[model samples]
Target: LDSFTLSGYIYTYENAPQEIRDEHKQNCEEINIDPKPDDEIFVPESANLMNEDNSKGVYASYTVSYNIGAKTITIMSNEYLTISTTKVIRKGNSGKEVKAAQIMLTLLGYNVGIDSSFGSKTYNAVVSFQKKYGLSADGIIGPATWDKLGRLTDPTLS
Candidate 1:
C-alpha cells in the first residue's frame, strides 16, 4: 500500500487563548449549549487582523500519526483557515479580493489580469465567465460568481 498525503489546518477552540476560551464558555452558558473545546473552530486568516490582537489564538499545527497492524502512517502540514467573501465586487472596486478574482478569471481563460483592480477589462472577463457558466452576467463578483470561479480554478472541484 502507498501512503497518501493529506493537508489542511485544524483549528480548535482549544487552540485559542484562555480569554477566548473563557468567553466561549460564557457564551455557551448563556446560550445553553455545551462548549466543545476539542471541536474544530473556523479561524479565518483575517481573524487575527480583524480584532487587531496578537494574543488570541495558539495557531499551531498538530502532528498526527496512525498505525495499522504492519504499516505506520504519518503526515504534517502548516495551514490556516481561508474565507471567501460573498460580498459583491463590481467595477471601481479594488483590493485583495478583486485581485484574487482576477487571478481566478485569468486562469479560467478570461482576458483579465492580477491587477487587483476591477475595471472594464475585469468586468468584461467576469461577464464572459458568467455567460459560459450560465450565471447572471452582471459583471459582478457575488456568491454565485465566486463559487463558479472557485470551481473552475480548482481542478478537483471542476
Candidate 2:
C-alpha cells in the first residue's frame, strides 16, 4: 500500500535531544499534526498507547510508535512527509493558514496583519485572542483556537 495508519502517544519535549526531535517531527507530520514540542512529555489522555514501540530518549525517557509502509523494509528513515491537511500553524510558520487566522484577528480588532508570515506580531495577537476568548493562550492555531475563531468569524479557514 502507498498509505498506512499509525496510532500512539507521541511524547514530545521542547528541549529534547536532536534524535528525539527528528523522530517526534516525523511522527507528528505523518499524522497531520504540526511538529510542536511541549515543555514536558505529559501524555495527553486523547492519545492511545496500543501501537507504542521503539523506546528512545535520554533527557527524558519515552516510547515511540513505529508505522512503516514499503515494498521492502526501508524502515530506518522518514522519506515521505505528508501534509494531507491544514497542519497547525504557530510562531515561525508562514502560509495561507497564517493569513486566515490573521484575518480573524484583524476582524476581531486585534493588532495583527495579513502578513502571511507568523512573526512576533502574529504571535502576540494569537495569544491576545486566546486570552480574550478564554482559550489556551499558547499562540498556536490548533483545533480549539480555530474553532473559536471560526465560530466568531463564521468563515471556512481551511
Candidate 3:
C-alpha cells in the first residue's frame, strides 16, 4: 500500500495551457466535433502532468488525455438547467439539459467538467461544434442544435 502513492491535479478548463488545449480541440475536429477554449480539462490526474502510478521509487506509469477534466474526480466536473422541456439551452441557463451537453462534449474529446450548468464553457463548445457541422454557430443551443446533436447519436446520420 505504501508503494502506491496516489497523486493527481484537477483544474478548470480556464486554467489549462493554451497549447495542450489546442491539441484537445484538434481532437474534436477529428471526431466531427468542435471545441471551445473555455471547456474544462480532463486527463487522468497524476502526481505529475505526465505520470500517475509512479512514486518515490516505483516506476509504474499511467497516462491521461487530460490537462485534466472529469464529470467527476470525487471533486468536480459542466452546464445548467434546461432539461425536462429541453428549452433551447443557452448561456445564463443551467439544468439537466446542459449536463447532457457537457457529457457529449467529453465523448467528442472536448475537455469539460460535468458540472451540469450552461455556461461559457458549454456555450463555446456548442458554438464550435455547430460550426464544424455547418450549424448556425450562434453559441446558442436551440431546437436546431438539439436536433443535430440527437441525430449524431444515431450513428447512421453522422
Candidate 4:
C-alpha cells in the first residue's frame, strides 16, 4: 500500500425507519440510480454537496482509507460517497420535472439556461425567486422552493 491509502464503508441508518428507506428507494428510482445490494450505503465522511459549504448544517461523514503501492496510508476522516458505475444511467435532468422547473423559472422572468442542465443560471434564478417571495436566498432548490415552484403557473407566475 502507498502512504496515502484510504478506505471506508457505506452505511444506512443503523435503525433506519422503514419509511425513510422507502423514501430513499423512491428517490433513487426517480433519479434512475440503484442502491447496492448491501444494506449499508457507504458515504465518505468528508463529502459535501456540489454547491454548498462543507462546514454548514448537519453533514454525515464516512471513513475512508487508501492503499498505495508501497505503504498503507490511513486517512483519519476520509468521508466519501461512491456511485455505482455498472448501471446504464442518464442522470441529472432530461424529463418532465426538469422541463417544468425550467419553464416555470423562465415564465417568472428568470434567465435560467434553456438547456436541461441545472447550472448556475438555474441556481441564480432560484435565488432571485426566493428573495422576491420572502424565502431564503440561498439559491438552493430545497423542499420549500420546490413546494412554492409547484404552485406557479406559466405565462408569468411570480
Largest TM-score belongs to which candidate? 1
Give the number of colliding residue pairs in candidate 4: 24
For candidate 1, write residues 1-158 as lDDT tens digits.
11122212234567754544554455445435566757443232322223324354344332223222222222223632233545678887755567557545654555543334566667789888889889989988887777766555444343
Models ranked on TM-score: 1, 3, 2, 4
Judged by whole-model lDDT over C-alpha atoms, candidate 1 comes out at 0.52
Give the per-residue lDDT of model 2 (tens digit) for 1-158: 11111211234456544544554455444435565545223222223334433353222111112222211111111322222123588877765566556555655666553434576767889998999889989998886676666555432222
**Of the candidates shown, which would achieve the greatest lDDT relative to the real structure?**
1
* lDDT, candidate 4, at 126: 77
TM-score of 2: 0.44
lDDT of each: 0.52, 0.49, 0.47, 0.41
Q: Candidate 3: TM-score?
A: 0.46
lDDT of 4 by residue, 1-158 (tens): 12122222233433233433454455445546664433342222232223432232233322222222322212133333222212111234433334335444654556543333344556668778989988888765655565555345311223
Q: Which ten residues in a row have the lowest lDDT in candidate 2?
A: 68-77
Each candidate structure's TM-score, on Cα atoms with residue i matched to residue i, is: 0.48, 0.44, 0.46, 0.36
Query: How good is model 4 by TM-score?
Result: 0.36
lDDT of each residue in 6-95, candidate 3, tens digit only: 122333444554444554555455434556545544333321244322132212221112111221111122212223223577776554
Lowest lDDT sum, 10 consecutive residues, model 4, at 81-90
